[PDB]
Amino acid sequence: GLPTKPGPGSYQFMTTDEDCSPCILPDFQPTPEIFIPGKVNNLLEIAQVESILEANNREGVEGVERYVIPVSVQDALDAQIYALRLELGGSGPLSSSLLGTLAKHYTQWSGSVEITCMFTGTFMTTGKVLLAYTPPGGDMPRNREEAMLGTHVIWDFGLQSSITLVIPWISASHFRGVSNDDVLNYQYYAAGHVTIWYQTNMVIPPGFPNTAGIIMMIAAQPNFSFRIQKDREDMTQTAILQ
Amino acid sequence: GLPTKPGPGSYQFMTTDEDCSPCILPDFQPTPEIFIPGKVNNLLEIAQVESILEANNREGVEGVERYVIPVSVQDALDAQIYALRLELGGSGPLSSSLLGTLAKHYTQWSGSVEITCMFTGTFMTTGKVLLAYTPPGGDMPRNREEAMLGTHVIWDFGLQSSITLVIPWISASHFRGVSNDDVLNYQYYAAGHVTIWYQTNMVIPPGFPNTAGIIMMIAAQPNFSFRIQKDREDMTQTAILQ
Amino acid sequence: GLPTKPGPGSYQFMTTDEDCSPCILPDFQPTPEIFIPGKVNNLLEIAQV
Amino acid sequence: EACGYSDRVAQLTLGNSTITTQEAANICVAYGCWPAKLSDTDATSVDKPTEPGVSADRFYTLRSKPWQADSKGWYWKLPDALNNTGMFGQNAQFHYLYRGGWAVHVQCNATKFHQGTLLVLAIPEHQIATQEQPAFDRTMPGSEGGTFQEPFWLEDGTSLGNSLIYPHQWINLRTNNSATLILPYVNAIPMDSAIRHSNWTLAIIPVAPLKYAAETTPLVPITVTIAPMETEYNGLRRAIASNQ
Amino acid sequence: STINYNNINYYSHAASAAQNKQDFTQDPSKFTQPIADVIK
Amino acid sequence: STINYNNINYYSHAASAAQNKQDFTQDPSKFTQPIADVIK
Amino acid sequence: STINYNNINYYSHAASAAQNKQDFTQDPSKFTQPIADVIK
Amino acid sequence: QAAGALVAGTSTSTHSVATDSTPALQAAETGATSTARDESMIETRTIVPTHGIHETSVESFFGRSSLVGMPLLATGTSITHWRIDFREFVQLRAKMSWFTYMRFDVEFTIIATSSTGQNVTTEQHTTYQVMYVPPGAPVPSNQDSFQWQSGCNPSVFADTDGPPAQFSVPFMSSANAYSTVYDGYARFMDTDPDRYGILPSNFLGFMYFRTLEDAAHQVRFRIYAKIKHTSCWIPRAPRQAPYKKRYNLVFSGDSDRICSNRASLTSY
Amino acid sequence: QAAGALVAGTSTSTHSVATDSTPALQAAETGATSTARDESMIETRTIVPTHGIHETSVESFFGRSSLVGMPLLATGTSITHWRIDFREFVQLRAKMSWFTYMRFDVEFTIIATSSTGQNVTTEQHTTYQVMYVPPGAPVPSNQDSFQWQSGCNPSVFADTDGPPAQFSVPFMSSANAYSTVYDGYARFMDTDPDRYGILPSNFLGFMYFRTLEDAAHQVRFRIYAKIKHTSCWIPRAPRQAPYKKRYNLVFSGDSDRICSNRASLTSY
Amino acid sequence: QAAGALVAGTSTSTHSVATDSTPALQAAETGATSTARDESMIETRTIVPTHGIHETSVESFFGRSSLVGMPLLATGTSITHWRIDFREFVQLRAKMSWFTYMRFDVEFTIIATSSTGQNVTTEQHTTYQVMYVPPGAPVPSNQDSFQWQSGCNPSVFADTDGPPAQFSVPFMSSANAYSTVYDGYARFMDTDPDRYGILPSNFLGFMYFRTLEDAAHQVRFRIYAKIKHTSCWIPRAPRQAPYKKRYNLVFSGDSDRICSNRASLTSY
Ligand SMILES: CCCCCCCCCCCCCC(=O)O
């Protein structure tokens, strides 16, 4: 017969191998493909859809209320509303979102992110907030004067319930690692901070609720992509399921 | 020689594999194919031929008489003649037929079925029966008023000995499983019931036989197909044959 | 290299197999075929006698 | 869109015999094939064959059988049943090989006051078997025919219900007076010995028993008339009538 | 729903080849309508 | 950044073939803008 | 009844090849009619 | 070669009120199967044929390997054999019961397994020889016998612990098709019941096995057969009773019934 | 087939001072995702699209083998089986949780390993048989059982110590796509909680295993499944709570939170 | 290359009543075989040629492997050899007896098997060397011997427990065809009976065997030869008496008969 030289890798089984194997039921003719709404071709189609951030993650807050960052009438000027370290890596508010649990499956990322906030106060209650993205290098802005030096947006409460803060892809790299792995020093891939401040103040009519809220949503933008699939660390098993 | 990489599946023997093997007698020239009547190319050609149902399966009835459902002069109105749960799966009258033992070899089915009944009474004996197919969802019709609400045919005894009740393919699926497997919950694939009733009554001249019969035959229709071959559960062996 | 799937029958030796094997003396050039009377091609030629 | 009118009357004429019927159920031609002679390409036996024609290609009527209340069924093997009757039998005996088709006419008349249903079957290679392997008198019963002991199993371990896959007609008294089957030759080889192999088996089985408008009931017989068709014989020698 | 296979047989004899993937159309009429005077 | 693969399947059935290397372009709008009166 | 095989030899020498599948027509006359003055 | 034949479809229907056209009315006495179609019995909608019929084709039905033989080689003799039939095991035999005549090629696959006296698997590496012994060839008497030279008989040699042996066989009968059933006798001037239903043309001989050196452990041969390139003629009522013997059709037939019984025909 | 689709790019932007065009202002009540692009929020430079999106494609996401079954064959019986689901192990199950309907083919790879009573590896060479037992086929009771003839059921035979066994399977459901989730009951006239969320159309049967000779040592089968030729419809909020049972979605839900907690929302 | 030659056919015949043409009448004295055909002796029908003749072709007849040698390597020496003839085993030798001259190529296949002192199979893995030792080359004396360097002699190395070794050989004779028979002497000025019927041109030498390391167990070599690319001349009356010796045609010839005897020529 034809002389051959089987080499290394023979009989090895690679889970990502792209080989054609024999069909056990060669004559089987499957049912037709029918029409079904919502076909998805790329997980990136899902990443581009806004999901609510579990932003109110203060110790002691139990579900659903974790989805609403509180805003209230102040008695002080230039006050802070929120701080969030921009990470797609484990633990944080960002990690449980649609974009975040999608990142649990990949090891590298790139692209711009978008944050849309919706105000929940009464129609008569007003306010102006400042949302800021601070590129990396140092720590979280201490005051609003420092925060306004970065990429920001000034939001005015009105008939338009929401505002969008675009967190542009500002990296030296092209790609960042999604993990903050301490052993491999992945904090090298630090992406900065997003902070929220009172620009004016939340002011209400007499007797109105002195506390309202902000619902933060997040989605990936069109220039966003993921690389290298890996396993979710939060999906575990201690025994076979039955 | 030519570098190669034998992979998983090497040396494995799959009974449904479609490979070409070496011929042990390469020079052998077989006898010519001669003409023989009745060549069959698809088992579906056989499925489309009517066979008699073992319908009179009442406890205590022994062979041949099991092939004749009895009809008799009634003293009551709107009376019932027969009930059959529409299943191609084991045990029932349907399973021993041509279509039924063919189903013993497959795991899924689809298509319309046809039931032709032939009356065996004397030429002078008359009658009108109602044959009904009830799509699934509930139980067997309790009375004729309930049965007539489904798919039915009114049969008039006369010079035409037989009538046909078409049991149309009315399914949500496209394909149904032939088994009623309790462990996998295949009763999910329930197909309904066929019932027979007196529309009028069997009336005879004086002295004539007060009991006659109906011979039920069943066949698959042209839109009928089977999928996935499996083994017959009724063809067993306890030792090698000799 | 080229992905392959050796199957059943591998390494088996069938006496009626029609395979080509390596020649042990690849450069050997045999003596010419000369004329000899009575060449037989089919045993049926003998059966008919 | 209609199923009974001028198909009820029929006349078949073969050689010097003609059959008529006023209550038929059309004619069944097995597998849609009409009897035919052996092709030059399908053939193997080199001798020029004997083609008897009218002397053998005609209708033969066997002894009638009475349809009784306890009757289980009857059967005849072909060519066996006719191997010793008339000019057909002579040719079958004198030759080592035979090939041929059949024209079968089963008849059973009663009255509009009776009711009963007979299944008439033409079974190819009907190899029989009961709780034990059959003896010569059961496998080749000759013109007298045999009787089913296990009709539900069709004497072969299969089923009466699925036997409709074989060429057949029904004689349902409220409808018909008889059955007519035309059968082509069937075998896995071109020709065969008439005394050692039975190609077809004619079976008549009561499915709905005979009942009448009284308890007595006159004698109601069943008669079988059969005609060999498109026959040819090879391997002429002395006459040999059975495989015993 | 129309599985078209590769013929290709590396051997000399036809017996060596794999199973015929071709579908011949069925004609049930030899069994369903074996009557001479066909009515519909 | 444009991996073009070789189709080639040595088997009769489509199921036997390797994974589809083709990239279909995504349309997020079924999920991002499911509103009737689309505004920009 | 006409087995046509594939030549194909992956080796340099003719000896390496498989058996000749060709059928040469026989001529029994060298043995059946070796007479000079042939009569029929 | 393409397997794209489809099942039939359904076209739309409407109400009928005809005093002439009556398709519901049949006459089964003719031996003909019903002529009624879905469309003529109910108001039907249109359905485009989307289902295939290849898995019910004669080729697909038989085209898969099944156990047909299972000879056991003892350590004392180091040799067994197998009479070539497909009548020893019920599954394949019952599949063939659907037809009267079948013409086909066969693909045999042989798997060898060594065991201990207590029938537990053991490691054993030798070469075995499978030799085709056709009717008239001399049979081997020992592992030593000269008949194993295989001067004319074809043979296959493979390792006990190597991949399965495998080869194809043409349609070999002296007949024009094999017969699954035979209403006749095996010989002339003989009327013995043991010779009724026996068609010698279907028996091509034996397969003899031996190890190339006296066996240390048991060794069992499982012979699988794949029917391919199939042609079938004359469908039959399939086998319903169990098979008792290898060479005839006798059955037990105690209770004359096949399907299950119930209390009333009017209730389940 | 080419996988060269790219991510989007960035084009240059300048200062805006408009009393009409305001893309920063949204209204999330509509259910629509934000319309704002980088360019409309900051002065941006030009960036040519250089990144690919193939690793996030539905095919690439599912197109790799994962453990789905792991039956253990005991030495006393020499036979086990596996109910065909992808619900026994969490990793693959959670990947599928992203979609409601999925249509695909599967590539199974089976790796066999022998061990001692103390679960340490041992050397053992035999041939095992994997047989597909569809719903309605009779199940094997012993290593001996006649059901292993495999007359119709397909089977795969491979060595314990040989390369992994492997084969492909078409899309088999009676449905037009498999459902990862089902808000309904398995049967009519039945309302049992054990039958809620159970869609029988997804269960194609069992895989039965045995050794061709009584087993000397344990033998464990690891079954890997590769989803290929994938079509997905209707994305879902993925699974966040751990899986407790194989046939339902119950979760523990003690602390109602998913991400980590912190002292203040104003400090890390 | 196509093997489609057919057997002859039969055409129709009629009655003859001729006082001149008489084909039934022959004269066997001429040495010629009968001239009568079926058609001229009986009224015949037409038969179209449907039978092939390839299985009786000289190539098909010889084209299959047969045992020709079977040397045994002892553990003490770890070396044997085989004189290259096809006269040691009767089956092939008798096949060749049909012809006087044969020109052909050969395909050798060698199967090695290890055994114990009691000739039972044992496991043994080594590499063996088969060396062609042509007339005039020095013969090896030990497993150690320098002759195994194989500087010019060709050699084949294979494992004891690996697939069979195999190779082809051209037509090697100094003559123009091998002779199965020789009515002459091997040497000039010599008239010894041991040298009558011995044609040295047919003896190409020996095959020497050894294990690459001293043998632990027996090891037996079975040498199979397949004659291919065959040319045959001058058919002979084949061998009827059994073969007693390897290098001559002596036979026992006790009872001067070949077929069986019977009581009368007039009854069976
Ligand atoms: C190695 C020599 C192979 C010769 C095999 C011939 C196989 C033919 C099988 C025919 C089975 C006939 C059906 C039956 O068993 O009744």
Ligand SMILES: CCCCCCCCCCCCCC(=O)O
């Ligand atoms: C060897 C016989 C192979 C038959 C395999 C069919 C595999 C289909 C897997 C479908 C998984 C459905 C999803 C689920 O587990 O809920």
Ligand SMILES: CCCCCCCCCCCCCC(=O)O
């Ligand atoms: C490995 C070296 C191979 C050389 C083999 C030459 C084989 C020629 C065989 C000729 C047999 C002559 C006939 C006879 O035995 O009388």
